[PDB]
Structure 1
């Protein structure tokens, strides 16, 4: 089998991407944030504290003839932005773009933190990291991809995120029309539960490529590109007026600037992020100071190839016996 679904930026800055997902019988369609950095499929629900729901579409398990409560199971997750959610668990039928998993664990939120409530466009998350990170207790549950993998034509899922435009998540096949050149595959460590790989280096704009190993994760659920302080300083040094702002929480730059591209290495291959992809707009409404899309990982403990990086590429999440990651230009 295969599946294919369109993924769309939630706003004019590509702050995140949502993909429609059918849950239950009859289907209930929720727009979920596909997150290769986490491993829980959780949704806003009929059980979510009312004051914490503000415009999201909810899953109502009592209206699904295929929903079954997973007895005694609870879940609780926290993310790198300080947000969190928790609740109980059902199993139900989940479909993405034509691909169906029966008995998928659907984590129903009883509580969500303020940043989830305040985002009316995201009805939940669909985790696509490794199932070892799933938070369900006392019996850990598998991701949608892990459950579907054996049925797929090929044990892969691909991310083709758009810049200011729709894109595609495919399951079970590689669309060879969706990229230029070839796909370069690179090794993955699953030991932290992430799609953790090692970039071979970087360049800023038209500058010299620096060969240097940068261990990091391919994370569709993180908006920005988080890299070592040395790399980030080298990038922003090329932008007149750019500075690291403690008050704002990262590098800012004049909104009047035209940004240089940023290249990262995948083996001997190169992915070029156009400069415009690095502009995240005014720091506050009407400001002429703009927030940068490349930020230091120093206060994080891991480098993160988030959407800024991934949207410049066609990315293969290869769940073969030995998982790997593939990147192509597009």
Structure 2
């Protein structure tokens, strides 16, 4: 079997992407943020603290005939940005774009941080990293991708994110019409539980390609591109007036400047990110200072190929016994 679902940006800046997911019997549709950087499927629910809910659609397990409490199981997760959530666990039927999994662990959020509460368009997350990162205790639970693997025609999923436009998440098949040229595959290390890979280098605008190894993770759940300080400083040195701001907590640039493209290497292939994708708009309403989409990973400890990078390519997440990442221009 296969699954195909449309993903839509939550705002004019592509800060996040939401994809509709059907949970329970009868179906309860929630808009979840598909995250290849985490492994928990957690939702806002009838059990979430009333004051911590602001306009989100909630999962009500009492209204689902297929919902069962996973007795004793709890979860607690903390994200790199600082956000966090926790609660109890249910098992229920979950469907994404026609692809159905029975007995999927659905983590019901009893408590959520302010970061999620203020985000009315996002009803939860659907984790797509390796199941070894799942936070359910005492019994670790599988991801939606892990549980669907046996029924999929091919153990793959693809991300085709749009720039200020809808995109697609496909499960079980590779759409040969969604990309141009060939797909370049690269090895994945699952040691830390992430889709971790090594880029072969980079270029700024029409400058020369610097062959250098950059280990990083393919993360659909992170908005920006976080790279080593050396690389980020070489990019921002080409933008007149750009500077790292302590007030803002990152590189800012004059809203009137034009941004060069950024190229990253995938084996022998090149993925070009257009300058426009690196513009995150004014730091505040009416400000003339704009926020950059390429930031330093020095304070985080890991390089992250987030939405900025991924939306410039057709990305294949190959979950075969020896996992790989596929990249193609589109």
**Interval containing the TM-score (normalised by the shorter chain):** over 0.9
Q: Distance in 2 between matches of 1:158 and 1:130?
A: 15
1:109-163 per-residue CA deviation (whole Å, 9 max, x = no partner) reads 0000001000001000000000000000110000000000111000000000000
Following the alignment from structure 1 to structure 2, what is the Cα–Cα distance between the partners of residues 46 and 286?
39
Structure 1 CA distance for aligned equivalents of residues 87 and 134 of structure 2: 13
1:210 CA drift (Å): 0.4
User: How far has the Cα of 1:285 moved from its partner?
Assistant: 1.5
State the alpha-carbon separation in 2 of the partners of residues 246 and 200 from structure 1.
31
Give ranges in structure 1 of 5+ residues lacking alignment. Answer: none
SS in 2 for 1:252: strand
Quote the offset at 1:49 in angstroms.
0.2
1:39 aligns to 2:39 (yes or no): yes
- 4+ runs deviating over 4 angstroms: none
Shift of 1:284: 1.2
Deviation of 1:103 (Å): 0.3
Q: CA deviation at 1:229?
A: 0.3
Q: What SS does structure 1 have at the residue aligned with 2:182?
A: coil
**1 CA distance for matches of 2:112 and 2:319?**
31
Q: Which moved more, 1:276-285 or 1:210-219?
A: 276-285
Question: CA deviation digits over 1:210-268, x for unaligned, max 9?
Answer: 00000000000000000000000000011111000011000000111111100000000
Deviation at 1:275, TM superposition (A): 0.5
* CA distance in 2 between partners of 1:97 and 1:307 (Å): 21
Larger deviation, residues 282-291 vs 211-220: 282-291
Q: Secondary structure at the match of 2:150?
A: helix
| Structure 1 partner of 2:170 | 170
Normalised to the residue count of structure 2, the TM-score between the two structures is: 1.00
After superposition, the C-alpha distances for 1:157-195 in whole angstroms (9 at most, x for unaligned) are 000000000000000000010001110000000000000
**How far did 1:286 drift?**
1.4
Between the two proteins, the alignment pairs up a number of residues equal to 330
Matched, 1:271 2:271: yes
Aligned to 2:277, what secondary structure does the other structure show?
A: helix
Q: Distance in 2 between matches of 1:23 and 1:102?
A: 10
Structure 2: which 5+ runs fail to align?
Answer: none
Q: Distance in 2 between matches of 1:133 and 1:85?
A: 15
- 1:84-120 CA-to-partner distances (Å, cap 9, x unmatched) read 0000000000000000000000000000000100000
Q: Distance in 1 between matches of 2:218 and 2:33?
A: 15
Distance 1:21 1:33 in 2: 10
Give the secondary-structure state (helix, strand or coil) at the position aligned to 1:183. Answer: strand
DSSP 3-state at the match of 1:328: strand
- Provide the TM-score with structure 1 as the length reference: 1.00
What is the alpha-carbon distance in structure 1 between the residues aligned to residue 191 and residue 89 of structure 2?
26
SS of 1:291's equivalent in the other structure is: strand
Deviation digits for residues 35-94 of structure 1, max 9, x if unmatched? 000000000000000000000000000000000000000000000100000000000000
Instruction: Give SS of 1:182's match.
Output: strand
1:76 and 2:76 correspond? yes
Task: Name the SS of the counterpart of 2:180 in structure 1.
Answer: coil
